[PDB]
Write an enzyme that holds these catalytic residues in place. Structure first.
Site, PDB file in Angstrom:
ATOM      1  N   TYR A   1     -20.969 -59.109-122.756  1.00 57.19           N
ATOM      2  CA  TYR A   1     -21.084 -57.671-122.700  1.00 57.19           C
ATOM      3  C   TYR A   1     -22.448 -57.145-122.202  1.00 57.19           C
ATOM      4  O   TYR A   1     -22.492 -56.136-121.478  1.00 57.19           O
ATOM      5  CB  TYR A   1     -20.785 -57.059-124.067  1.00 57.19           C
ATOM      6  CG  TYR A   1     -20.390 -55.613-123.937  1.00 57.19           C
ATOM      7  CD1 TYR A   1     -19.103 -55.253-123.531  1.00 57.19           C
ATOM      8  CD2 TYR A   1     -21.321 -54.598-124.172  1.00 57.19           C
ATOM      9  CE1 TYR A   1     -18.758 -53.906-123.372  1.00 57.19           C
ATOM     10  CE2 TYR A   1     -20.991 -53.291-124.019  1.00 57.19           C
ATOM     11  CZ  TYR A   1     -19.726 -52.936-123.626  1.00 57.19           C
ATOM     12  OH  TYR A   1     -19.450 -51.606-123.489  1.00 57.19           O
TER      13      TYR A   1
ATOM     14  N   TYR B   1     -13.753 -49.430-128.991  1.00 52.97           N
ATOM     15  CA  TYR B   1     -12.603 -49.866-128.181  1.00 52.97           C
ATOM     16  C   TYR B   1     -11.540 -50.035-129.245  1.00 52.97           C
ATOM     17  O   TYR B   1     -11.801 -50.683-130.251  1.00 52.97           O
ATOM     18  CB  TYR B   1     -12.881 -51.222-127.555  1.00 52.97           C
ATOM     19  CG  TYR B   1     -13.864 -51.183-126.416  1.00 52.97           C
ATOM     20  CD1 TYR B   1     -13.425 -51.083-125.081  1.00 52.97           C
ATOM     21  CD2 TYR B   1     -15.237 -51.246-126.657  1.00 52.97           C
ATOM     22  CE1 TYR B   1     -14.330 -51.056-124.008  1.00 52.97           C
ATOM     23  CE2 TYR B   1     -16.151 -51.209-125.585  1.00 52.97           C
ATOM     24  CZ  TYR B   1     -15.684 -51.121-124.272  1.00 52.97           C
ATOM     25  OH  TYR B   1     -16.573 -51.162-123.238  1.00 52.97           O
TER      26      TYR B   1
ATOM     27  N   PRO C   1     -12.317 -51.302-115.871  1.00 55.49           N
ATOM     28  CA  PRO C   1     -13.472 -50.814-116.655  1.00 55.49           C
ATOM     29  C   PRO C   1     -13.658 -51.185-118.096  1.00 55.49           C
ATOM     30  O   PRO C   1     -14.719 -50.885-118.669  1.00 55.49           O
ATOM     31  CB  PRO C   1     -13.441 -49.288-116.418  1.00 55.49           C
ATOM     32  CG  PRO C   1     -11.968 -49.014-116.260  1.00 55.49           C
ATOM     33  CD  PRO C   1     -11.425 -50.216-115.466  1.00 55.49           C
TER      34      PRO C   1
ATOM     35  N   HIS D   1     -27.871 -49.017-127.203  1.00 56.93           N
ATOM     36  CA  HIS D   1     -27.107 -49.490-128.352  1.00 56.93           C
ATOM     37  C   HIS D   1     -27.329 -50.967-128.649  1.00 56.93           C
ATOM     38  O   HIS D   1     -27.365 -51.810-127.719  1.00 56.93           O
ATOM     39  CB  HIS D   1     -25.616 -49.237-128.149  1.00 56.93           C
ATOM     40  CG  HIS D   1     -25.262 -47.787-128.113  1.00 56.93           C
ATOM     41  ND1 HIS D   1     -23.971 -47.343-127.945  1.00 56.93           N
ATOM     42  CD2 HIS D   1     -26.033 -46.680-128.205  1.00 56.93           C
ATOM     43  CE1 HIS D   1     -23.962 -46.023-127.935  1.00 56.93           C
ATOM     44  NE2 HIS D   1     -25.200 -45.595-128.091  1.00 56.93           N
TER      45      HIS D   1
ATOM     46  N   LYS E   1     -18.367 -53.312-116.234  1.00 57.25           N
ATOM     47  CA  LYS E   1     -19.154 -54.175-115.375  1.00 57.25           C
ATOM     48  C   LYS E   1     -19.328 -53.756-113.918  1.00 57.25           C
ATOM     49  O   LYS E   1     -20.258 -54.204-113.275  1.00 57.25           O
ATOM     50  CB  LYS E   1     -18.524 -55.580-115.425  1.00 57.25           C
ATOM     51  CG  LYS E   1     -18.617 -56.287-116.791  1.00 57.25           C
ATOM     52  CD  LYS E   1     -19.991 -56.945-117.018  1.00 57.25           C
ATOM     53  CE  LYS E   1     -20.450 -57.069-118.510  1.00 57.25           C
ATOM     54  NZ  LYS E   1     -20.915 -55.764-119.213  1.00 57.25           N
TER      55      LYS E   1
HETATM   56  C1  LIG Z   1     -12.969 -44.925-115.663  1.00 55.99           C
HETATM   57  C2  LIG Z   1     -14.104 -45.761-115.000  1.00 55.99           C
HETATM   58  C3  LIG Z   1     -15.093 -46.225-115.844  1.00 55.99           C
HETATM   59  C4  LIG Z   1     -16.143 -47.065-115.390  1.00 55.99           C
HETATM   60  N1  LIG Z   1     -17.100 -47.400-116.390  1.00 55.99           N
HETATM   61  C5  LIG Z   1     -18.131 -48.086-115.857  1.00 55.99           C
HETATM   62  C6  LIG Z   1     -19.160 -48.421-116.745  1.00 55.99           C
HETATM   63  O1  LIG Z   1     -19.330 -47.930-117.836  1.00 55.99           O
HETATM   64  N2  LIG Z   1     -20.113 -49.340-116.345  1.00 55.99           N
HETATM   65  C7  LIG Z   1     -20.153 -49.964-115.068  1.00 55.99           C
HETATM   66  O2  LIG Z   1     -20.919 -50.908-114.828  1.00 55.99           O
HETATM   67  N3  LIG Z   1     -19.133 -49.568-114.177  1.00 55.99           N
HETATM   68  C8  LIG Z   1     -18.180 -48.658-114.588  1.00 55.99           C
HETATM   69  N4  LIG Z   1     -17.211 -48.246-113.681  1.00 55.99           N
HETATM   70  C9  LIG Z   1     -17.314 -48.746-112.326  1.00 55.99           C
HETATM   71  C10 LIG Z   1     -18.213 -47.851-111.475  1.00 55.99           C
HETATM   72  O3  LIG Z   1     -17.714 -46.475-111.595  1.00 55.99           O
HETATM   73  C11 LIG Z   1     -17.932 -48.404-110.021  1.00 55.99           C
HETATM   74  O4  LIG Z   1     -17.918 -49.792-109.964  1.00 55.99           O
HETATM   75  C12 LIG Z   1     -19.095 -47.888-109.061  1.00 55.99           C
HETATM   76  O5  LIG Z   1     -18.864 -46.461-108.799  1.00 55.99           O
HETATM   77  C13 LIG Z   1     -19.296 -48.713-107.751  1.00 55.99           C
HETATM   78  O6  LIG Z   1     -20.003 -47.762-106.929  1.00 55.99           O
HETATM   79  P1  LIG Z   1     -20.212 -47.904-105.365  1.00 55.99           P
HETATM   80  O7  LIG Z   1     -21.418 -47.185-104.897  1.00 55.99           O
HETATM   81  O8  LIG Z   1     -20.147 -49.336-104.931  1.00 55.99           O
HETATM   82  O9  LIG Z   1     -18.897 -47.143-104.912  1.00 55.99           O
HETATM   83  P2  LIG Z   1     -18.427 -45.592-105.154  1.00 55.99           P
HETATM   84  O10 LIG Z   1     -19.054 -45.023-106.333  1.00 55.99           O
HETATM   85  O11 LIG Z   1     -16.935 -45.579-104.910  1.00 55.99           O
HETATM   86  O12 LIG Z   1     -19.049 -44.966-103.830  1.00 55.99           O
HETATM   87  C14 LIG Z   1     -18.615 -45.150-102.526  1.00 55.99           C
HETATM   88  C15 LIG Z   1     -19.058 -43.860-101.701  1.00 55.99           C
HETATM   89  O13 LIG Z   1     -18.588 -44.005-100.321  1.00 55.99           O
HETATM   90  C16 LIG Z   1     -18.074 -42.806 -99.843  1.00 55.99           C
HETATM   91  N5  LIG Z   1     -17.243 -43.302 -98.797  1.00 55.99           N
HETATM   92  C17 LIG Z   1     -15.931 -43.776 -98.863  1.00 55.99           C
HETATM   93  N6  LIG Z   1     -15.409 -44.084 -97.678  1.00 55.99           N
HETATM   94  C18 LIG Z   1     -16.406 -43.774 -96.805  1.00 55.99           C
HETATM   95  C19 LIG Z   1     -16.410 -43.745 -95.428  1.00 55.99           C
HETATM   96  N7  LIG Z   1     -15.388 -44.149 -94.705  1.00 55.99           N
HETATM   97  N8  LIG Z   1     -17.518 -43.264 -94.856  1.00 55.99           N
HETATM   98  C20 LIG Z   1     -18.509 -42.857 -95.636  1.00 55.99           C
HETATM   99  N9  LIG Z   1     -18.626 -42.829 -96.951  1.00 55.99           N
HETATM  100  C21 LIG Z   1     -17.523 -43.304 -97.487  1.00 55.99           C
HETATM  101  C22 LIG Z   1     -17.451 -42.174-101.029  1.00 55.99           C
HETATM  102  O14 LIG Z   1     -17.226 -40.759-100.893  1.00 55.99           O
HETATM  103  C23 LIG Z   1     -18.548 -42.510-102.117  1.00 55.99           C
HETATM  104  O15 LIG Z   1     -19.651 -41.521-102.177  1.00 55.99           O
HETATM  105  C24 LIG Z   1     -16.163 -47.385-114.054  1.00 55.99           C
HETATM  106  C25 LIG Z   1     -15.174 -46.913-113.123  1.00 55.99           C
HETATM  107  C26 LIG Z   1     -14.174 -46.141-113.599  1.00 55.99           C
HETATM  108  C27 LIG Z   1     -13.040 -45.778-112.602  1.00 55.99           C
END
Ligand SMILES: Cc1cc2nc3c(=O)[nH]c(=O)nc-3n(C[C@H](O)[C@H](O)[C@H](O)COP(=O)(O)OP(=O)(O)OC[C@H]3O[C@@H](n4cnc5c(N)ncnc54)[C@H](O)[C@@H]3O)c2cc1C
Ligand SMILES: Cc1cc2nc3c(=O)[nH]c(=O)nc-3n(C[C@H](O)[C@H](O)[C@H](O)COP(=O)(O)OP(=O)(O)OC[C@H]3O[C@@H](n4cnc5c(N)ncnc54)[C@H](O)[C@@H]3O)c2cc1C
Lengths: 392, 394
Positions: free
Chosen positions: B385, B201, B293, B72, B297
């Site tokens: 953004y 938004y 969210p 976009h 970011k």
């Molecule tokens: C409604 C919503 C919208 C969002 N929109 C966006 C967006 O458009 N753009 C963007 O940049 N970000 C967005 N985000 C943020 C993005 O979803 C998160 O920041 C991102 O998932 C970070 O991922 P991660 O791998 O660090 O953690 P996660 O995705 O939480 O992964 C952590 C993993 O660890 C596992 N885990 C947990 N505890 C343990 C343990 N003790 N042992 C082993 N494994 C474990 C979990 O099961 C999981 O698989 C959004 C989030 C939400 C809630």
């Protein structure tokens, strides 16, 4: 007594409206509660946007291109000092430093030189019959109750004036935020420590360095609301001031006995609409911004500009109802200045019971706005003043 | 069992880090509490900054996102019943964002990882970290009743907000910065075409609403909801009705609705820890910080932590430069706080907060007016953004 426009208040707003109306042949009488000397004892601020400088000339004053300089802006925070290139960033605009006392004295001279009417020590001013075609004002001057008939009343009487208090409560919607601190300001007969206005966000609290001339300075530190000015000796003020500035600025500060010291409470205040029948509020009688953004007198100027112009049109066209748009026009400029003044205040002062997150966000706010061209531009364009609204 | 880098979490953070480490020749094992199926059930967001897209390409997992991601040039904000477009490419100087589901991003990394034959242990229950300040840190977990030990050089805590790694650091060595918002996001994934090509938004008296997308026939919508709400109290129709009530009539008009594929409520919060490491343990992504969210970011911040962690680990391994990892927190935090500020800002101007006084509400309206109607204001939204420029490292 009779006139065309009764003006309440011979502060900057009332004096400026008076000059403009006179220039356009509209009779006006100003009623002022205090003495000329008392009004002139107010120090207040010293920064003018360009909208105001032209208006002053246009009002028949500003013939003192000296005693009045142009200065830039600097913000010090977390160990650094960032200068805001106002001229380059805002399309060639800048601000002028000129004490409100000198502006006021300049307008007082321009009015006196026109022989226009100003009644000082006008006590117990009360407004009457705002919904009628012949509204009038009553007051007392040395014992006698006098009366002034007019077509319209301009309430240019400041925050605690009588005019906003003369509009039926239920006609007004009030917006207000009272900040948990005031500004202890000090006027000194010393050369300023910088030719730049210097705003400082510091752990101990806000501080500001400004000037009135090459050998006259104006400084402020924020202080809590329980503090009393008598608890602050000149020395205590200078020490707190230095403790909040970059050591480079602080070591070169010349100090001296204060010529004037006072604590000003900070608040944001707006009423909608800003008029009722034949009465129109302008300046501090209608709204207040915290002085962090240096917008007060500049907003008063544009309120007065719009009022002057809508009155002139009404007379010229024999149509009062054009005057109905006054509030809507002014309010558009008022709210933008309120947002900027609120922003400046919120990013520069230390607030009570702020948690860790809030403190870091405030710091990040400064880092981004003082370190990004776009951020810097939002600051400069707002500080030199946004465009004088369309009016009419 | 032994590896060079143990990664806790097989979410995007951990997968992306494991992928880049793999490609640079560094041994790594990801341990994951859930099952593949579960991980893949998380829908989350869909907006990607360019830095994220390039890292995904550098990780060798971008062919599919290239084919399926929507790029976009703008984003839209509705307030006082008026959509205002932010021309991102023009204001940011040419930058854009890519709409690509996090589920798809995650599926693509898992695919890449499986093809490589790299190690991933799903259902690794009761992960506990050990000997962090020493030279031989190790992890323990339970896989089908047995307790296994994974010895390693370094540990990457990529386990999200409820992970185990942030909690393995002695509390007193960490400083927490948090803000919990008085509302959550009720999100609905539906197999309907999005009502708009652009993201919308909407700040509305009834509360915040967001119109997003995943494909020409898959949609994603959100409405803010108070914290006392439970998803089961929101049937798809209650949702569609409230969403429409918060959108410009011209938008609500064309809205195609349908049965939800998934629905959930996400509470909003800001959270940052300092430092983001301890001995051989380094936190990345949601394990180290959370942003609401509204700013899109979080995953993008996760991407930059990993990028930085990967780069420094290569230096430590491909140069024995082990003390260079000391700068990880400082480098990441600079980007983190910038995202936290923008995310908080977006949140504050777009949502309705409980018992906000009249001045405060007018100020919010004025903020929108200024930032969506002034060139400089618009520019600060756009450059933020599309994601500010990654830092330097070292
Ligand atoms: C409604 C919503 C919208 C969002 N929109 C966006 C967006 O458009 N753009 C963007 O940049 N970000 C967005 N985000 C943020 C993005 O979803 C998160 O920041 C991102 O998932 C970070 O991922 P991660 O791998 O660090 O953690 P996660 O995705 O939480 O992964 C952590 C993993 O660890 C596992 N885990 C947990 N505890 C343990 C343990 N003790 N042992 C082993 N494994 C474990 C979990 O099961 C999981 O698989 C959004 C989030 C939400 C809630
Ligand atoms: C610390 C400080 C710094 C500031 N810095 C700046 C700055 O640099 N730039 C800027 O633009 N603004 C600044 N301001 C704000 C600025 O001083 C005010 O906005 C300006 O005074 C408004 O002018 P005015 O004529 O509306 O009201 P005032 O100046 O308050 O005058 C109203 C007048 O009406 C008279 N009056 C009151 N009640 C009655 C009554 N009942 N009957 C008759 N007369 C009455 C009063 O005696 C007074 O003379 C600052 C203010 C403070 C406190």
């Amino acid at each position: 007594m009779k006139t065309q426009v009764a003006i309440i208040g011979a502060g900057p707003s009332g004096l400026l409206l008076g000059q403009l109306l006179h220039k356009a042949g509209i009779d006006n009488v100003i009623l002022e509660r205090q003495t000329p000397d008392y009004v002139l004892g107010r120090i207040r601020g010293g920064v003018l946007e360009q909208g105001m400088v032209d208006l002053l000339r246009e009002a028949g004053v500003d013939r003192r291109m000296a005693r009045l300089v142009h200065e830039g802006v600097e913000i010090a925070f977390a160990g650094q000092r960032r200068r805001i290139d106002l001229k380059r960033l805002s399309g060639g605009k800048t601000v002028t430093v000129y004490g409100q006392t000198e502006v006021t004295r300049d307008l007082m001279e321009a009015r006196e030189a026109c022989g226009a009417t100003t009644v000082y020590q006008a006590a117990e001013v009360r407004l009457h019959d705002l919904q009628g075609e012949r509204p009038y004002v009553t007051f007392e001057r040395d014992g006698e109750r006098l009366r002034l008939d007019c077509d319209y009343i301009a309430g240019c009487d400041g925050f605690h004036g009588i005019s906003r208090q003369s509009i039926p409560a239920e006609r007004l919607k009030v917006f207000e935020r009272v900040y948990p601190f005031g500004w202890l300001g000090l006027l000194a007969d010393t050369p300023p420590v910088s030719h730049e206005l210097i705003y400082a966000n510091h752990p101990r609290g806000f501080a500001l360095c400004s000037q009135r001339s090459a050998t006259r300075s104006r400084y402020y530190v924020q202080v809590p609301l329980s503090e009393k000015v008598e608890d602050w000796s000149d020395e205590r003020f200078w020490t707190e001031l230095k403790a909040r500035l970059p050591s480079e600025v602080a070591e070169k500060l010349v100090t001296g006995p204060s010529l004037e010291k006072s604590i000003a409470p900070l608040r944001s205040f707006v009423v909608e609409p800003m008029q009722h029948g034949r009465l129109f509020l302008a300046g501090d009688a209608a709204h207040i911004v915290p002085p962090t953004g240096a917008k007060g007198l500049n907003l008063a100027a544009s309120d007065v500009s719009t009022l002057y112009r809508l009155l002139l049109k009404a007379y010229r066209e024999g149509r009062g109802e054009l005057l109905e748009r006054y509030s809507a026009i002014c309010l558009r400029r008022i709210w933008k200045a309120e947002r900027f003044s609120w922003w400046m205040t919120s990013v520069l002062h230390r607030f009570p019971d702020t948690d860790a997150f809030s403190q870091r966000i405030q710091q990040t706010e400064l880092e981004y706005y003082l370190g990004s061209e776009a951020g810097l531009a939002t600051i400069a364009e707002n500080y030199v003043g946004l465009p004088y609204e369309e009016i009419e």
